[PDB]
Design an enzyme around this catalytic site. Structure first.
Site, PDB file in Angstrom:
ATOM      1  CE  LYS C 153      -3.557   2.172   2.826  1.00 30.52           C
ATOM      2  NZ  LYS C 153      -2.734   3.299   3.310  1.00 30.52           N
ATOM      3  CD  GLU C 179      -1.212   4.637  10.550  1.00 33.79           C
ATOM      4  OE1 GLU C 179      -1.352   3.863  11.518  1.00 33.79           O
ATOM      5  OE2 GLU C 179      -1.548   4.316   9.394  1.00 33.79           O
ATOM      6  NE  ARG C 180      -1.514   0.167  14.393  1.00 34.10           N
ATOM      7  CZ  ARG C 180      -2.459  -0.068  13.495  1.00 34.10           C
ATOM      8  NH1 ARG C 180      -2.549   0.677  12.411  1.00 34.10           N
ATOM      9  NH2 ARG C 180      -3.314  -1.058  13.676  1.00 34.10           N
TER      10      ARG C 180
END
Lengths: 50, 71, 538, 71
Positions: C153, C179-180
């Protein structure tokens, strides 16, 4: 006979997949309705105190 | 477009405008109904007017019913 | 000019004796550890505004001075933000100095009105074969990316960034919504490694602005960071006049963050559990992604589907806005095909002959029908036999087996670790290439001829090299010398070549340690405010 | 135990202690993270910490969301 059974259990997995897909859709409806109804119960309980 | 009125309360617009836009278009087409002519009205996604009205009702703290809809 | 009245979690009430700030206006809490920005959510009456914090509210005192900035959250925009990382409120978190602001724009904005919109509905050429042919991208549309982990991705993200900057000269914004931080740092270093982000003096040649609102940020900061990425993209659209790419990483986390800030402001949740304003809080973001008369914003939004349930209201509300899906599959990636776009589950609204023409439409539908026809006989090949059915069925097997190879393509940002040079493929070359494989002009070329190549005049050179490779095999032999004593020693020699590392039983841990003494007594403040023991009577 | 800390907020402890035990244990393990060494934190039943936080927030009359939980 063996080839007729191979063609007969071919339609059985087709039927048990389309029945599974209908049942999965109806389970998703029941899951969404469960979360909504439990949430409406919790909100109505909290609003009767505040 | 010579014969069409185009009423639009798009996705960026306020939920009161999306709730009210089918009534606005219906009042515009009822002019042609009331003076003897013929009207065609298309409410595209009345299921989005219901969602905008549900937004207005839960922001007015009215009690939700089935699916969350005001009743 | 205003002072803090209530602090309930991330939700702060501020009281203004003068005039109130507007809703969505930004307020600075004067005097705090870090910069604490609040965003006005509503006017509660009695000269109180209700605000939602963009950082932690721990350490906040009722009566703390709060300065109204007179505007919403304002972020630096321009070419000086390229290759930088911003948080939601515009601060640089990449630790590389300030941000060279061309302008300072409000993140809150109405959508481009009806007279400014484009009625054209044209295609965004992306240079990727499977994306340009089967699931084209609308210039100004929203594209759902159903990828995940290990399907390539991030390589596809960096290649859309690379190819859009290379072809159309537009810049990209990546909005990492929720997001992390490990994944966000991985994407940052992978963008530095692939050359789409450059550090130092070459910073102007970066193609991407990262706007990161991390997962440990409060819900108000995750709910607004997509608008910050939108504002950075809207500057490039409206001032620079470009075809911008915006990447909203996990649009579902945007939905979930706005649901959290709607729950915290005491609003009744709608269906399944979501905010009552779910369609309008999503449409306020998605309607600013459009084509204006100046340029466009094309949005590639990763979509998470909550319980593998597409009728859940967050994906059902998102899918109303989407113009294409590109489903990345693990089964496509385990045939070594890259990019891992599922060629049959990816859709596009741009795939009808009134926007792409009957030539492109019929080539795409023929390719999709051929791959589908191969797909629904693999339970007939694996059960009854490979060469069991007809030659025409094996003709579709061979044609779809080489089209399924031909959708793969080497990527230009992947060449720094794969060696194979990436190949931008144009649209008319893609149409003329897949039409030839579909009619059967390349039924004689091997299946590995159509693998990791640009266009149709490279599968020929691939087969030409593969048939020069026949004559390069009789140059040598195959053998492995010295079956037991080439380099394989006695096992005592192999343990007497490994070097012993130093292990100590004093573990240490008193290296730069304060070692304060903690009181066992409880120490409180008296009314003057000084540290005092507890008064020992209830 | 030569390398393990145990932070134990049991069932009889108050709900704010069960809420604050993972944060306190993470503060103890961030000593090893921050000074060069390596940590391993195990929040056993973060489910029960979540239930304790839900208890404190419903009793503080913060608005409940899904299943009863806060925002």
């Amino acid at each position: 006979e063996h080839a007729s059974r191979m063609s007969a259990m071919e339609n059985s997995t087709k039927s048990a997949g389309e029945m599974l897909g209908k049942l999965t859709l109806d389970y998703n409806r029941k899951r969404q309705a469960t979360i909504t109804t439990e949430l409406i119960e919790i909100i109505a309980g909290a609003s009767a105190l505040m | 477009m010579r014969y069409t009125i185009m009423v639009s309360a798009t996705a960026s617009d306020a939920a009161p405008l999306q709730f009210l836009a089918p009534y606005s278009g219906c009042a515009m087409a009822e002019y042609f109904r009331d003076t003897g002519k013929h009207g065609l009205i298309i409410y595209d996604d009345l299921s989005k007017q219901s969602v905008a009205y549900r937004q207005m009702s839960l922001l007015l703290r009215r009690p939700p019913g089935r699916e969350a809809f005001p009743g | 000019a205003g002072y803090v009245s209530q602090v309930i979690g991330p939700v702060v009430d501020v009281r203004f004796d003068g005039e109130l700030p507007s809703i969505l206006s930004s307020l600075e809490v004067e005097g705090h550890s870090v910069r604490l920005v609040l965003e006005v959510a509503q006017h509660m009456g009695d000269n109180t505004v209700r605000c939602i914090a963009m950082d932690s509210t721990d350490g906040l005192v009722r009566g703390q001075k709060v300065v109204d900035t007179g505007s919403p959250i304002k972020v630096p925009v321009g070419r000086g933000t390229l290759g930088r990382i911003m948080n939601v409120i515009g601060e640089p978190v990449d630790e590389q100095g300030p941000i060279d602001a061309a302008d300072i724009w409000s993140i809150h904005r109405e959508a481009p009105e009806f007279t400014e919109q484009s009625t054209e509905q044209e295609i965004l050429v992306t240079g990727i074969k499977v994306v340009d042919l089967l699931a084209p991208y609308q210039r100004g549309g929203k594209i759902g990316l159903f990828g995940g982990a290990g399907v390539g991705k991030t390589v596809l993200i960096m290649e859309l960034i690379n190819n859009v900057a290379k072809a159309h000269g537009g810049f990209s914004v990546f909005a990492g919504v929720g997001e992390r931080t490990r994944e966000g740092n991985d994407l940052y270093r992978e963008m530095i490694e692939s050359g789409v982000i450059k550090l130092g003096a070459e910073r102007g040649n970066s193609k991407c602005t990262l706007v990161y609102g991390q997962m440990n940020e409060p819900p108000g900061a995750r709910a607004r960071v997509a608008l910050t990425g939108l504002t950075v993209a809207e500057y490039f659209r409206d001032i620079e006049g470009q075809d911008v790419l915006l990447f909203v990483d996990n649009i579902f986390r945007f939905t979930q963050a706005n649901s959290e800030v709607s729950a915290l402001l005491g609003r009744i949740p709608s269906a399944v559990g979501y905010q009552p304003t779910l369609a309008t809080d999503l449409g306020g973001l998605q309607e600013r992604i459009t084509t204006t008369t100046k340029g466009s914003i094309t949005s590639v939004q990763a979509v998470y589907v909550p319980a593998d349930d597409l009728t859940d209201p967050a994906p059902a509300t998102t899918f109303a806005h989407l113009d294409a899906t590109t489903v990345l599959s693990r089964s496509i990636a385990e045939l070594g095909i890259y990019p891992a776009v599922d060629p049959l589950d990816s859709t596009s609204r741009m795939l009808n002959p009134n926007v792409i023409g009957a030539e492109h439409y019929n080539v795409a539908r023929g390719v999709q029908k051929v791959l589908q026809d191969y797909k629904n006989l693999q339970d007939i090949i694996a059960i009854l036999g490979m060469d069991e059915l007809s030659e025409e069925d094996k003709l579709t097997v061979a044609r779809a087996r080489k089209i399924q190879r031909f959708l793969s393509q080497p990527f230009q940002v992947a060449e720094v670790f794969t060696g194979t040079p990436g190949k931008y493929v144009d649209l008319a070359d893609t149409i003329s290439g897949f039409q030839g494989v579909l009619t059967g002009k390349y039924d004689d070329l091997p299946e590995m001829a159509f693998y990791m190549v640009g266009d149709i005049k490279e599968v020929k050179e691939k087969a030409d090299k593969m048939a020069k490779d026949i004559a390069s095999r009789k140059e040598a032999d195959n053998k492995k010398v010295s079956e037991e004593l080439k380099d394989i020693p006695s096992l005592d020699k192999l343990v007497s070549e490994i070097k012993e590392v130093v292990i100590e039983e004093d573990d240490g841990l008193e290296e730069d340690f304060k070692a304060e003494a903690l009181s066992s007594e409880t120490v409180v403040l008296n009314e003057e405010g000084k540290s005092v023991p507890l008064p020992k009577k209830n």
